[PDB]
Curated annotation (Swiss-Prot), chain A:
Keyword Cell cycle attributed: no
Complex formation: Component of the mitochondrial large ribosomal subunit (mt-LSU). Mature mammalian 55S mitochondrial ribosomes consist of a small (28S) and a large (39S) subunit. The 28S small subunit contains a 12S ribosomal RNA (12S mt-rRNA) and 30 different proteins. The 39S large subunit contains a 16S rRNA (16S mt-rRNA), a copy of mitochondrial valine transfer RNA (mt-tRNA(Val)), which plays an integral structural role, and 52 different proteins. mL48 is located at the central protuberance. Interacts with OXA1L.
The keyword Transit peptide belongs to this UniProt entry's keyword annotation: yes
Keyword annotations of the record: Mitochondrion, Ribonucleoprotein, Ribosomal protein, Transit peptide
TM segment ranges: none
Naturally occurring in which organism (per UniProt): Homo sapiens (Human)
Span covered, complete protein: 48 to 212 of 212
Protein name: Large ribosomal subunit protein mL48
UniProtKB/Swiss-Prot annotation, chain B:
Recorded superkingdom: Eukaryota
A GO term, aspect molecular function: structural constituent of ribosome
Keyword field: Chaperone, Mitochondrion, Ribonucleoprotein, Ribosomal protein, RNA-binding, Transit peptide, Transport
Name the UniProt record assigns to this protein: Large ribosomal subunit protein uL18m
Keyword Chaperone recorded: yes
GO biological process, one term: rRNA import into mitochondrion
UniProt-annotated location(s): Mitochondrion
UniProtKB/Swiss-Prot annotation, chain C:
Modified residues (N6-acetyllysine): K179
CDD domains, A to Z: NUDIX_MRP_L46
Species for this entry: Homo sapiens
InterPro entries, per the entry: NUDIX_hydrolase-like_dom_sf, Ribosomal_mL46, Ribosomal_mL46_N, Ribosomal_mL46_NUDIX
Family in the record: Belongs to the mitochondrion-specific ribosomal protein mL46 family.
GO cellular component terms listed in the entry, alphabetical order: cell junction; cytosol; mitochondrial inner membrane; mitochondrial large ribosomal subunit; mitochondrion; nucleoplasm
GO molecular-function term, one example from the UniProt record: structural constituent of ribosome
Complex formation: Component of the mitochondrial large ribosomal subunit (mt-LSU). Mature mammalian 55S mitochondrial ribosomes consist of a small (28S) and a large (39S) subunit. The 28S small subunit contains a 12S ribosomal RNA (12S mt-rRNA) and 30 different proteins. The 39S large subunit contains a 16S rRNA (16S mt-rRNA), a copy of mitochondrial valine transfer RNA (mt-tRNA(Val)), which plays an integral structural role, and 52 different proteins. mL46 is located at the central protuberance.
Protein name: Large ribosomal subunit protein mL46
Principal localisation: mitochondrion
Subcellular location: Mitochondrion
One GO term (biological process): mitochondrial translation
Curated annotation (Swiss-Prot), chain D:
Subcellular location: Mitochondrion
Record-stated family: Belongs to the mitochondrion-specific ribosomal protein mL55 family.
Signal peptide range in chain numbering: none
Protein source organism: Homo sapiens (Human)
Domain of life of the native organism: Eukaryota
Protein's recorded name: Large ribosomal subunit protein mL55
Part of the whole protein covered: 46 to 80 of 128
Subunit details: Component of the mitochondrial large ribosomal subunit (mt-LSU). Mature mammalian 55S mitochondrial ribosomes consist of a small (28S) and a large (39S) subunit. The 28S small subunit contains a 12S ribosomal RNA (12S mt-rRNA) and 30 different proteins. The 39S large subunit contains a 16S rRNA (16S mt-rRNA), a copy of mitochondrial valine transfer RNA (mt-tRNA(Val)), which plays an integral structural role, and 52 different proteins.
Length: 150, 120, 228, 35, 102, 137
RNA sequence: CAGAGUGUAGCUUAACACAAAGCACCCAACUUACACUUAGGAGAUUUCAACUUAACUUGACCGCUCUGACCA
């Protein structure tokens, strides 16, 4: 009851929550792990996903893009005709990271470069101007947002 | 004929029993406990006790679960308790170790279905 | 201002160009990983042709057989040559050239004459107003004797510090001593000239870094350098 | 769940560097050509 | 989709199963020290990083303002993995062409 | 009209400024563990145990038993830690553990319990049966 | 090298004894991945003595922290 001293004991939604960087930390950072071996690409992506969770930094989402394959033509000996030699496929693994401090930036970068596996490429970049944020949104999120603008 | 604690249909687990079996699975030990509704515990079979440690390889395996299952079966038989109740979560009920632990109750003579209270 | 003089330092680091040697336990990794492959994988087209060729021969138009294609491809193996992981520097222990200890990391050290005695230390530079410590690190690279390299710079915060006091020789009220801050850097490409090699710089690993560094200086250094 | 038999093969890069890679064919050596 | 692709299942010998569990039981601990040597080396530099920051804090406040400051020139970075063998300085492969399939 | 609480709120200790920074339960079992560890804790409001749970007098139960036997914990621990070391050493014992086919002698382990934990379990069970409340008052 | 402080695997005001406990932590299975879940393995009282339980009370020894000494 409101009058009784035990008022509000059932309150539960106050513990439940109802990109531009700061001047000390970064807004959003994405890493790209390209490789011609799918197993190595996802294994390292899983490795960095587990390690970044250990370091207690927020992760936005990890997804996949359509995989691009490239073929190789080889010049025939004593000739001038291009002939099919091999077909390769590059697999890109991306994990979105937001909220990485400037001081911890050097430590984070030195780890994944020191633990970089064979034949895979890493890259660190912002990827912020293309953040269209057009994600499908669920029903309860719409109701609170619609009540906010109403 | 004793009345059972009916109700609590909105929370888990229900309390319509006289004696309940509770199995606790920690990182290093698995604890099988049998207790009354009111809170008093009648008999227990934990891997911490030195009696079964000398004969078991590990305290956190299916072999350990069978070890305390037969121990609890013999303890319940010699304590006079024959009927009991078990209310597990879906995942632990689907665990292979638990089912063989229930098999220990069957071969030990322990039934996990309390008889219905006779109202009239 | 203060009796503790300030210096900026750079620790040049070159990552290994080749992977570290595999522990024999990791040999059992790939051996089983391939072993769980063919036990779970299905027939490849190479095996499909091989089975069909064998079946038809037993019953009895492919000029090239699957076994034959293996032979020529294996024959081509004896034709080409792979790069040698162990180089001439490894045999000679050339602690100045790039081709020594390709499996592990390397860190540069330079000779400096302080207190009438040469001390193996990292490059250093005095701090000046209006310039960041990273600018001192860039200036430190420029001050190197006949150097031409580019260094990848990560972060801005220092990677460590080391405080040493004067041995009661120059120690004064205005100047008690000097402290130095290390900053990590990544070496992409570049090399020194051949005019001075032995008396200019040395490149070593973390394991043997203790032979050249002072025990106090090494202790501070080992707290941020790795052997991965 | 469904994949072919990947043999241990090798790729030679533009500068001559070699890396490990899995391929459908038993072509354990490969050097990509100059474009 | 062809069922002729299916390979027969070879019986796994009992002794071979023994060495599987033995290497599995050692793989778990081997990776544990691999994480153990990882967890100490991050904190080793982390404490060494903070003491350098606090020592520079007493040295000069203005330097600290530009020390923790974000460097905008960072993060175009790219790093490629090592190779089995060092590249050959003199190696010219024959001509060729590439194509893209989407 | 409002009245200040007579004691600390159940969720007052948790900071709400960094609620997203705080780690979550992320599982049903972890919340359940916290649920019934906190359920048995005393509270200043009306609880189920206040009306239904049996009440015990503030005086400690009087013990009229023999003085407890004295054993050397260090020596006992050393024998116990070496006993399972050789037990884990045998491959045959390890083979049975991994195959989930090992068994233990029920008669032998019961005899050991009668000397180690027998007196305590019997006292605990006898208290449940009401022997100590009816006789000995 | 000296003067103070400290000691259970990472943490714990865990350890009455019946007993060195709980969590965190690592591997495999699911998953692009995380996470949940299932199945696994790794762990500690620094060492010697004190009528004796004694990680627990007292010493010595050993290992760490701080301050002086040494200092390129």
């Amino acid at each position: 009851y409101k009058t009784k001293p035990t008022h509000g004991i059932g309150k539960y939604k106050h513990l439940i929550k109802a990109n531009l960087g700061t001047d000390y930390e970064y807004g959003v950072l994405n890493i790209h792990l390209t490789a011609y071996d799918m197993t190595l690409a996802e294994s390292y992506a899983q490795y960095v996903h587990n390690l970044c969770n250990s370091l207690s930094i927020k992760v936005e989402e990890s997804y996949a893009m359509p995989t691009k394959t490239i073929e190789v033509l080889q010049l025939q000996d004593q000739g001038s005709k291009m002939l099919l030699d091999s077909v390769l496929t590059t697999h890109e693994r991306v994990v979105q990271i937001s909220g990485l401090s400037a001081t911890f930036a050097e430590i984070f970068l030195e780890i994944i470069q020191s633990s970089l596996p064979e034949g895979v490429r890493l890259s660190v970049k912002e990827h912020t101007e293309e953040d269209f944020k057009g994600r499908f949104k669920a029903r309860p999120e719409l109701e609170e947002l619609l009540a906010k603008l109403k | 004929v004793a009345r059972k604690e009916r109700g609590w249909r909105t929370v888990f687990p229900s309390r319509e029993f006289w004696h309940r079996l509770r199995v606790i699975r920690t990182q290093h030990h698995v604890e099988a406990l049998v207790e009354h509704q009111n809170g008093k515990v009648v008999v227990s079979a934990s891997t911490r006790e030195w009696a079964i440690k000398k004969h078991l390889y590990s305290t956190r395996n299916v072999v350990a679960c069978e070890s305390i299952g037969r121990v609890l079966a013999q303890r319940c038989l010699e304590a006079g308790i024959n009927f009991m109740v078990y209310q597990p979560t879906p995942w632990e009920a689907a665990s292979d170790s638990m089912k063989r632990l229930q098999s220990a109750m069957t071969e030990g003579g322990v039934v996990l279905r309390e008889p219905q209270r006779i109202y009239e | 201002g203060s009796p503790w003089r300030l210096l900026g330092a750079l620790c040049l680091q070159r990552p290994p160009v080749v992977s570290k040697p595999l522990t024999p336990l990791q040999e059992e990794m790939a051996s089983l990983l391939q072993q769980i492959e063919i036990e779970r994988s299905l027939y490849s087209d190479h095996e499909l042709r091989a089975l069909d060729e064998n079946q038809r021969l037993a019953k009895k138009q492919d000029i090239l057989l699957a076994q034959d294609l293996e032979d020529m491809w294996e024959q081509k193996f004896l034709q080409f040559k792979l790069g040698a992981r162990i180089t001439e520097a490894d045999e000679k222990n050339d602690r100045t050239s790039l081709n020594r200890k390709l499996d592990r990391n390397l860190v540069l050290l330079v000779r400096e004459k302080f207190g009438d005695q040469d001390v193996w230390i990292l490059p250093q530079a005095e701090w000046q107003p209006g310039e960041t410590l990273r600018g001192t690190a860039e200036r430190t690279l420029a001050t190197l004797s006949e150097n031409n390299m580019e260094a990848k710079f990560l972060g801005n915060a220092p990677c460590g510090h080391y405080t040493f006091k004067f041995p009661q020789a120059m120690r004064t009220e205005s100047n008690l001593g000097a402290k130095v801050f290390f900053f990590k850097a990544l070496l992409l490409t570049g090399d020194f000239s051949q005019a001075g090699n032995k008396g200019h710089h040395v490149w070593v690993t973390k394991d043997e870094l203790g032979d050249y560094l002072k025990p106090k200086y090494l202790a501070q250094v080992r707290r941020f350098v790795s052997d991965l | 769940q469904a994949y072919a038999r990947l043999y241990p093969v090798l790729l030679v890069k533009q500068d001559g560097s070699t890396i490990h890679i899995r391929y459908r064919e038993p072509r354990r050596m490969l050097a990509m050509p100059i474009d | 989709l062809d069922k002729a692709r299916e390979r027969p299942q070879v019986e796994l010998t009992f002794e071979e199963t023994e060495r599987r569990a033995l290497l599995l039981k050692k793989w778990s601990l081997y990776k544990q020290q691999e994480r153990k040597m990882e967890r100490d080396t991050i904190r080793a530099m982390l404490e060494a990083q903070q003491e350098a920051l606090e020592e520079l804090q007493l040295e000069s406040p203005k330097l600290h303002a530009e020390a923790i400051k974000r460097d905008p020139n960072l993060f175009p970075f790219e790093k490629e993995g090592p190779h089995y063998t060092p590249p050959i300085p003199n190696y010219q492969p024959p001509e060729g062409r590439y194509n893209d399939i989407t | 009209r409002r009245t200040p609480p007579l004691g600390p709120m159940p969720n007052s200790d948790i900071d709400l400024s960094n609620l997203e920074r705080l780690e979550k339960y992320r599982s049903f079992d972890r919340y359940r563990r916290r649920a019934e560890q906190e359920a048995q804790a005393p509270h200043w409001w009306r609880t189920y145990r206040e009306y239904f749970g049996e009440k015990t007098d503030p005086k400690e139960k009087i013990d009229i038993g023999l003085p407890p036997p004295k054993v050397s914990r260090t020596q006992q621990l050393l024998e116990r830690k070496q006993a399972i070391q050789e037990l884990r050493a045998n491959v045959e014992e390890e083979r049975a553990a991994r195959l989930r086919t090992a068994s233990v002698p029920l008669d032998a382990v019961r005899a050991e319990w009668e000397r180690t934990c027998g007196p305590y379990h019997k006292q605990r069970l006898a208290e449940y049966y009401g022997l100590y409340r009816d006789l000995f008052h």
